[PDB]
Design a binder for these strands. Structure first.
Lengths: 113, 200, 94, 85
RNA sequence: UACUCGAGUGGCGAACGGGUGAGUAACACGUGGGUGAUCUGCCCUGCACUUUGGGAUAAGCCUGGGAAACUGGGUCUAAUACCGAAUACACCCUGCUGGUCGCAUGGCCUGGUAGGGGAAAGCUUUUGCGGUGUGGGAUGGGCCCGCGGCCUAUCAGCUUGUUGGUGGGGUGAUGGCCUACCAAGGCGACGACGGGUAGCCGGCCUGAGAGGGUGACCGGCCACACUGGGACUGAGAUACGGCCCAGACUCC
């Protein structure tokens, strides 16, 4: 089937995966049809970007993901947004944005003087 | 592979104060050796060579890494010579030298080499780190009991601090506010001949 | 509750074949003619605009077309080997 | 020969081929008889054997032995030459 | 005893993946199209269903033959395997016919219509799995065309299944793809027919730029699997770790 997959990218230590929707007879880093999301596990809260509408489309036409992707879609609620069991419940931890460069250096200035 | 030879050597060769306290330079500005008195041929090439020679020997970097910085400089949208110089001045060790915590350019290189700084929560034993705007350079913990550096922080009356630096730290905490620009730098030979050489 | 057994298929735009417009040279076979089509390209190195020549063999079920004509043609599925086009209408007589 | 699944698959395909050779041979007998009927002009026997051959083609395609498009071209030729004779 | 499981039947996968670039100057590749000229297991989506009947055998057991590889017969057992029959009348063959869009054959209105046929399988005690035909999807592909990409007339004639047509056969489909027959036609100076070399491309290197060289890695196509052919099964096979045959080569 047209399985919704993760494909590897990057370098030897820190992988970064792209969420693709392609045929099962492809290879691990081969040709695709549509890159639709991604997933950066190497940091602990693990960035996840998922174009929801297009994933819903591909689940409608007759895709069939694998277990890890299904886990991600259930996290975000995309599977739950397709099946409506409780509702389309976002469990997604957007990462804690950090004190920016400007605020940092202004804090330095106002603290030191 | 860091340089190792005498600072006096290149100094007597090309004839510039770069170290500052070089009484052998004052005593013998002529080049050294058996034909140290002898006369040299002039050209465009010799001048354009001597330019980068002086610059990169002042700052420690090597020819090829200077060429990498050059590739970035003419990759910029600005103009090659002066933006190369801004790139080249953006180094960590040169910033702290102009802050004046260190006696020699070798000494600033050595300080940053041995990991004696502590930048925004990470040890940085990187003698070529690039410092953009708004970089809070704190110094590490054990920095206190370095004896010649105690004397340094106490009576640092050597070459002044330029405009684009400052210290707002009782712990000798040096900070960037703007970047260097050539109108205010006023350092030896300008990089137009360098541009013409590397784009020969 | 019982869904519809049937569902019509989406409206598909039946594609637009090309046409070519040439001068007939022969009907010395049966039900087919040879047409010397022409195209103005540019030489992709020296930029000059170039007239070229192209034989193309066509077909008519009723044998309307003679020699020394100006026709309209349309592409279609292969009628047979080295037959690929068809006549539309004898277009500017002579 | 070296994979055991392939060994099992060998003997399996041998069985299958045998079956399908017999199927096709039977169908070929049917059409040969029909053509001979048409060719001698037993229009009665033409239909009386066409019915047989047609059911035979239908259940040939139904077993997936041959494709319904093929079976349809066959039946079409039969029906047309019966209409002409 | 079945948690389980040697071997066996039965499915399913094995055609993907992985490698090489000898051949190939070819719609093989790249781009842009066409299909009223086509197939699609699997995944999903819908609709209607899933009835009945039957034989035999592998294994196992007995035994023979051969050095082994392996084969033979007698006996016996089972099914989602094989074989029947009955429905479907959504599908398919043909006849008559209304409308409609066309780009010609034609396509469409599950068009109507006299009429002929075609399906299937049961296990399960636990998130429960299935099976049949049928329409609509999505994915994969097969076919054709335009166009672009080396050297060489110290390679000028080439062509007889070649060129068009008729009737048939053939494939999933158009088609000299094959068949008997009718005409003699076709290709070529814009380089046929030949020879030499060579996998193609996104790309890589250089260059101010054009352009030239070039096809490491990675990604996508093509072709190949000791040499040369062929077919099978099957949704789908250059069927690398399948078959057959003829060689060559190594072993018993």
């Amino acid at each position: 089937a047209v399985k919704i997959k993760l494909t590897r990218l990057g370098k030897i230590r820190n992988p970064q995966y792209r969420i693709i929707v392609a045929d099962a007879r492809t290879r691990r880093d081969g040709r695709a049809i549509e890159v639709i999301g991604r997933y950066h596990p190497k940091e602990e809260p693990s960035l996840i970007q998922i174009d929801s509408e297009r994933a819903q489309y591909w689940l409608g036409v007759g895709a069939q993901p694998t277990e890890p992707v299904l886990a991600l879609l259930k996290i975000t609620g995309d599977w739950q947004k397709f099946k409506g069991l409780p509702g389309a419940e976002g469990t997604l931890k957007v990462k804690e944005p950090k004190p920016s460069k400007l605020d940092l250096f202004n804090a330095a200035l106002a603290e030191a003087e | 592979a860091r340089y190792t030879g005498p600072a006096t050597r290149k100094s007597r060769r090309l004839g510039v104060d770069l170290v500052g306290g070089d009484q052998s330079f004052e005593k013998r500005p002529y080049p050294p050796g058996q034909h140290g008195r002898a006369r040299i041929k002039e050209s465009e090439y010799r001048q354009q060579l001597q330019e980068k020679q002086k610059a990169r020997f002042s700052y420690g970097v090597m020819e090829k890494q200077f060429r990498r910085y050059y590739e970035e400089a003419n990759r910029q949208p600005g103009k090659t010579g002066d933006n190369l110089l801004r790139i080249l001045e953006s180094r960590l060790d040169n910033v702290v030298y102009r802050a004046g915590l260190a006696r020699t350019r070798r000494m600033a290189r050595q300080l940053v080499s041995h990991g004696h700084f502590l930048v925004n929560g990470v040890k940085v034993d990187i003698p070529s780190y690039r410092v953009s705007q708004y970089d809070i350079i704190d110094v590490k913990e054990k920095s206190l009991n370095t004896l010649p550096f105690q004397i340094a922080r106490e009576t640092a009356g050597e070459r002044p601090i330029p405009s684009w630096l400052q210290v707002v730290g009782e712990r000798q905490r040096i900070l960037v506010h703007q970047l260097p620009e050539r109108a205010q730098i006023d350092v030896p030979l300008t990089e137009q001949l360098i541009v013409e050489l590397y784009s020969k | 509750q019982k869904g519809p057994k049937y569902t019509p298929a989406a409206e598909k735009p039946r594609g637009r074949r090309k046409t070519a417009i040439g001068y007939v040279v022969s009907d010395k076979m049966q039900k087919t003619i040879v047409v010397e089509l022409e195209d103005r390209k540019s030489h992709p190195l020296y930029g000059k605009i170039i007239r070229t020549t192209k034989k193309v063999k066509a077909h008519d079920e009723n044998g309307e077309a003679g020699i020394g004509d100006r026709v309209s043609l349309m592409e279609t599925r292969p009628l047979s080997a080295t037959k690929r086009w068809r006549l539309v209408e004898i277009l500017e007589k002579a | 020969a070296n994979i055991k699944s392939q060994i099992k698959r060998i003997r399996t395909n041998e069985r299958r081929r045998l079956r399908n050779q017999s199927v096709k041979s039977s169908l070929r007998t049917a059409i040969r008889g029909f053509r001979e009927a048409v060719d001698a002009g037993d229009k009665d026997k033409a239909s009386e054997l066409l019915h047989a051959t047609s059911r035979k083609l239908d259940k040939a395609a139904s077993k997936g032995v041959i494709h319904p498009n093929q079976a349809a071209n066959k039946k079409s030729a039969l029906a047309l030459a019966l209409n002409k004779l």
